Design a protein around this nucleic acid. Structure first.
Lengths: 114, 120, 209, 56, 122
RNA sequence: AGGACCGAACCGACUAAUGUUGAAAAAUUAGCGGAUGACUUGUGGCUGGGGGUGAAAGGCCAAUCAAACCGGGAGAUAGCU
RNA sequence: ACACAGGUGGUCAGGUAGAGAAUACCAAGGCGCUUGAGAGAACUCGGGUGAAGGAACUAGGCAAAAUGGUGCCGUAACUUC
RNA sequence: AAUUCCUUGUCGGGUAAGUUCCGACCUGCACGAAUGGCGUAAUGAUGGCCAGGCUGUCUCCACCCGAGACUCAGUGAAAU
RNA sequence: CGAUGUCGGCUCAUCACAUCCUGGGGCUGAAGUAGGUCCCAAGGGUAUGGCUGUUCGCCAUUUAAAGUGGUACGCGAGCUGGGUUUAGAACGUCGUGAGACAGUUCGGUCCCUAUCUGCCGUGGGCGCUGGAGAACUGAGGGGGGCUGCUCCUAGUACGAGAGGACCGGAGUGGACGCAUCACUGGUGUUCGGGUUGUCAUGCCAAUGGCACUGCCCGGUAGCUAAAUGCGGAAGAGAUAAGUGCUGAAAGCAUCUAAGCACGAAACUUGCCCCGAGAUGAGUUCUCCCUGACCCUUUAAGGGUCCUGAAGGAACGUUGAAGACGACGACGUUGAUAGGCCGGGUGUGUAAGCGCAGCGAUGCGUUGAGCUAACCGGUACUAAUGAACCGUGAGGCUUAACCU
């Protein structure tokens, strides 16, 4: 698959920041509303990262004014404009799906700081 | 329907296969040539040859890592003391299969699997 | 028009500029080179026979090698044949490239599908399973009844029963061609085409409107 | 589930038309020992492709 | 992926608190409701002096699902809990005046424009 | 204390699945009821065929029960096959 | 009837965890069940997991899933207390 | 009503919708007082109905682990 | 009657048309919208639930519609066993009673390893007239045909207004089918980790066995669906009902008698698949074989020697092919499988050692170690030289050419 490997890496964006699950992340996303092309922000804990080159996703979980939301993002989509890491987070797993069962003080991730 | 799956099942469950290859790898390291069935030889390659390559690099973590697999201490003496420095330049291909007929008891296609030196 | 013989390289996606992922299948289409031209005056129908790829010298037989040697062409991995469309003209030894699809806008892709072996009627024919409990005695995935009673006292032809699913010619129609890349010899079509990776495809222009 | 007329010996042999065993079909001759063996197998003396192996 | 017998939460303040889906409208043998699809519901629980009382049968539109919606780039948006807004039965455009929680960009249509005029996110 | 409670041995047999030319002429597996009592069990004894015994089902009386098994009357009789 | 997955009374009863003769892993001791080798289709049997939904199944929640310990708090109608 | 034919009686409760269920009425075809009447706490591998939880029961099946099934060697039935 | 299992449910159908929807059309007490009624039409489509054993029915909410029948009231060697209709028991009633009631109620064993036909798949033999390798045409056969809603045309036509089109076009759904794994997920007892009890490796540390994979948490490839692509068409021909044009018999009239034109999801094609056993066994291209000598009851006869081609088969390494055969790839002038190397992925920062802490533990080396089926390479191992099958120019007659 040098054809496919050569063909996908022509599309991979270069400046994707290094983040790992547990991190609070603001993701700025192009949202189109008719003619105006707005850019809105989705901040939450990374609970899952799939690395597959171009087909790399990451799931961000927010508790939005009420109930909880999980956006899975394709990392190399042109929709996903910015990824910035707000708070670096210290966890032990690789997929943090237990946080789907926890709210508030139980869903509280220590900071990494190294 | 199996498409691209690897690994014979050998009419055993997973723990009996694991145990069986642990014994049979121990026997091939011990005696340097054993007679088994042809499928059990062909799976014994994929169990035995990784122990030789682990033995090509002697350290406490590889002795313990080759004692988790194989579970015998004489075996991880011959690996790391004899076989690992024996091959040492041989990149894969530590063992050959030689087909040798059929059993009498059940007409199974036997094969002698042996290490690839045995220059003694 | 005619088609070209490809090879299923696999699947990827193509992010558009406005952020719409398109699932594409990559089909490497090398130089299909014409080995025979067929006319009404000798065969009753106008069609070209093309070959593609390359074969080992010791693996091509003497009949086959004599055929490609007459054509004045390197032996490929197979011979295929395309029916011609009344104003088209090809010569023997002419090479045909993916550039032919630089206008076509939508194609039909024909391959052999993945062989699923002896399949039961729930996989094969989408029969619905009977109860998994509530008394049911050894008949969960079985086909049920297969016909009527004394009248007819036969099972009709083409009753849906279990047997070999997969591994047969299927054509997927009207796939949007996303890119034609004459440099790398590639054709990116939108969607899944039949076959495992590396299988030989046949990409023609779409006959539907 | 069981037959309704006894099948003949005709139909019986017709069914057994395929039960025939195929011969070996020719077994190959060793390079050094010059003795016969199945192909791709070792000989009774324990040679294979002209070199000595097992030796029991 | 809301089907019959499914208990949905209520996103507006119409008075209902917990509803059950009784049909997925919009086709024959249609199985699932979804992103912004209309269902028929019955009200299984209400607050004591809301506009809708217990055991009423009316329409609703699904605004959030646990299964989620897929965007055209491949990105999904799953919520935690299925939710609907109770539309009026005859001529739609819903009962309640507030809308709680987020909604999605796939109620961006004519009718549900009302629902996304409210609805603090998305 | 208890025809007490939970629960093994022990006695049983409510459900399901398998088995149904069985591994088995009534079982196996997973759950199930009783489990100091009107309990359960060993060894011996007693009751016998229009008779026994029966917390009663026409149940049980040696894989047999609206009248055991064996032998005899007996080659019953059979306007029926 | 079988070298039969059944039946058969008493006696001895170690370790660790455990209330325990339950249960798990072990000791003494005894076994691997008298057809094997492959392959890894449908289908059947015994099991594991399952998106969203959660009895819509169905004669019927049959089956499965769930619950499950010890201590403490707390506990309604009704009652022969 | 373990009793009611007509009958899914009529009204009410539960349900989006209830021939079943609960309450009531009484025109009891064909209840009824030790072949007991009516109540009845506790009990029941008892019958019927409802709800919470729970789930592959199901929507609609998918994959996996094992034992057969399939191939090879040995033995080698049966009903008909 | 030396047994033809009988309701209902499930699974799986299949035909008829007296058509429920969709399609065409005539009359209308048809303005439009919506209808009523009748002719044509069988392509495809033609609910989910409450109650009840129920078919039915009533109800709730859908739908374009929820057709009517035949098929042993289709389907129990396909499933169930709720009902009816065994043996237990009770109620009401009948009988003095044993009992009895298609009155009611509770409980209650559904066997079969397929020989033949049929059907779904899949091979072996032989034929097709020398052998062999491929590519084909296509007789014929099968699959597929469903449809909503929104928008424009146009708030035009019609109508007093309310309301509201025909014909034509664009979009987007439902149900169904095919493919596929890029995405989202499921699984992933073959990968990594956490952790309980216990046993062992002398012991600490580290590991391993067993407890449903011990219980769990993630997860590669593959398979998959709830995932994502695509499909049902346009068009042509011959028509049904129907509408006509010209036109007599019948100096008018008249769609028909001569002649001519329209006309539907039905019909034949168009689309997809199988397909030369299509014994009517076809076509095209290519490849190979260019020896002698006897015998006779002189035939497309038999035999001996020499030759053994093209190719196939066997064997081996095997495969996104597979029950087995089959099919595909490769066999050393070689990446076919395993190993190995690099990468990726997954898990989540190994062991050892050092430091902090009384200790459990924490931190550093360290995103470490280990990584299955993945990807790119590499002859290290195994794919052996050969043998085997297959022959030696391919009948007769007639015709046209031998330029």
């Amino acid at each position: 698959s040098n054809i496919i490997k050569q063909l996908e890496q022509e599309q991979m964006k270069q400046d994707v920041p290094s983040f790992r699950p547990g991190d609070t992340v603001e993701v700025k996303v192009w949202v189109v509303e008719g003619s105006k092309k707005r850019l809105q922000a989705f901040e939450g804990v990374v609970i899952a990262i799939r690395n597959r080159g171009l087909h790399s996703a990451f799931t961000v979980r927010k508790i939005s004014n009420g109930e909880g939301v999980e956006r899975v993002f394709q990392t190399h989509s042109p929709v996903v404009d910015s990824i910035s890491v707000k708070r670096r987070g210290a966890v032990r797993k690789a997929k943090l799906y237990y946080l789907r069962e926890r709210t508030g003080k139980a869903a509280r991730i220590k900071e990494r700081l190294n | 329907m199996r498409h691209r799956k690897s690994g014979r099942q050998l009419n055993r469950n997973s723990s009996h296969r694991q145990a069986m290859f642990r014994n049979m790898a121990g026997s091939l390291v011990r005696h340097e040539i054993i007679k088994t069935t042809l499928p059990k030889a062909k799976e014994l390659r994929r169990v035995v040859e990784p122990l030789i390559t682990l033995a090509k690099t002697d350290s406490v973590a590889n002795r313990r890592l080759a004692f988790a697999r194989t579970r015998d201490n004489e075996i991880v003496a011959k690996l790391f003391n004899e076989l690992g420095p024996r091959f040492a330049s041989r990149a894969g291909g530590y063992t050959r299969i030689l087909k040798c007929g059929f059993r009498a008891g059940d007409n199974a296609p036997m094969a002698y699997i042996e290490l690839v030196d045995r220059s003694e | 028009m005619i088609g070209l013989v490809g090879k299923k390289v696999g699947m990827t996606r193509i992010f558009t500029e406005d952020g719409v992922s398109i699932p594409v299948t990559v089909i490497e289409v090398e130089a299909n080179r014409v080995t025979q031209v067929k006319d009404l005056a000798n065969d009753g129908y106008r069609a070209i026979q093309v070959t593609t790829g390359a074969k080992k010298a010791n693996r091509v037989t003497k009949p086959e090698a004599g055929h490609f040697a007459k054509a004045g062409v390197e032996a490929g991995r197979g011979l295929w044949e395309f029916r011609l469309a009344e104003g088209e003209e090809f010569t023997v030894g002419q090479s045909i490239s993916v550039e032919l699809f630089a206008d076509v806008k939508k194609v039909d892709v024909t391959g052999t599908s993945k062989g699923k072996g002896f399949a039961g009627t729930v996989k094969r024919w989408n029969f619905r399973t009977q109860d998994a409990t509530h008394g049911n005695s050894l008949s969960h995935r079985v086909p049920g009844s297969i016909g009527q009673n004394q009248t007819p006292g036969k099972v009709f032809k083409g009753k849906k029963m279990a047997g070999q699913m997969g591994n047969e010619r299927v054509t997927v129609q009207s796939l949007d061609v996303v890119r034609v890349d004459a440099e790398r010899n590639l054709l990116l079509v939108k969607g899944a085409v039949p076959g495992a990776t590396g299988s030989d495809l046949i990409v023609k222009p779409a006959v539907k409107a | 589930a069981v037959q309704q007329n006894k099948p003949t010996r005709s139909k019986r042999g017709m069914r057994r038309s395929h039960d025939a065993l195929t011969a070996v079909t020719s077994l190959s001759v060793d390079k050094t020992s010059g003795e016969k063996h199945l192909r791709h197998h070792i000989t009774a003396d324990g040679y294979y492709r002209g070199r000595k192996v097992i030796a029991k | 992926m809301i089907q019959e017998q499914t208990m949905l939460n209520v996103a507006d303040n119409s008075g209902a608190r917990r509803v059950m889906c009784i049909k997925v409208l919009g086709g024959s043998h249609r199985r699932y409701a979804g992103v912004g699809d209309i269902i028929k519901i019955t009200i299984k629980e209400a607050i004591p002096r809301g506009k809708v009382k217990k055991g009423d049968v009316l329409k609703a539109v699904v605004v959030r699902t646990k299964k989620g919606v897929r965007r055209p780039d491949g990105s999904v948006i799953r919520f935690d809990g299925n939710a609907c807004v109770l539309l009026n039965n005859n001529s739609e455009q819903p009962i309640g005046t507030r809308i709680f929680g987020p909604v999605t960009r796939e109620l961006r249509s004519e009718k549900f424009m009302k629902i996304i005029s409210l609805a603090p996110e998305v």
